[PDB]
Amino acid sequence: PVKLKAVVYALSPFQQKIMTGLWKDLPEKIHHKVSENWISATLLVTPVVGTYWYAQYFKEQEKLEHRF
């Protein structure tokens, strides 16, 4: 058991609004999500999208060259 010194104040769940906080400070929420995760999103989408479009391009060149 860890020895902990702290003071905690809590409010009853029936004395606060439960759902309005979902849409509070939304521009901050969208800004934080993008600004911290854009590199992560790029590292995940770019190789799957780059490989896919290359394969489509290759199949188009391979099909056309086999024609007459």
Binding site: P1, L4, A10, S12, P13, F14
Partner: protein
């Protein structure tokens, strides 16, 4: 005082105790004290 019979106690208790909000003030080694939701739930019995 004599007017407070068993039916009176149950009526008053249902007005002030049953499924009511509570206030808690604790100090010391109180990590094992149940949280607010546990005390809140123990204000009613679901078997009745």
């Amino acid at each position: 005082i004599d007017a407070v019979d068993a039916s009176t106690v149950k009526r008053v208790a249902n007005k002030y105790i049953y499924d009511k909000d509570i206030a808690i003030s604790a100090i010391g080694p109180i990590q094992d004290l149940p949280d607010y939701n546990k005390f809140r739930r123990r204000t009613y019995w679901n078997r009745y």
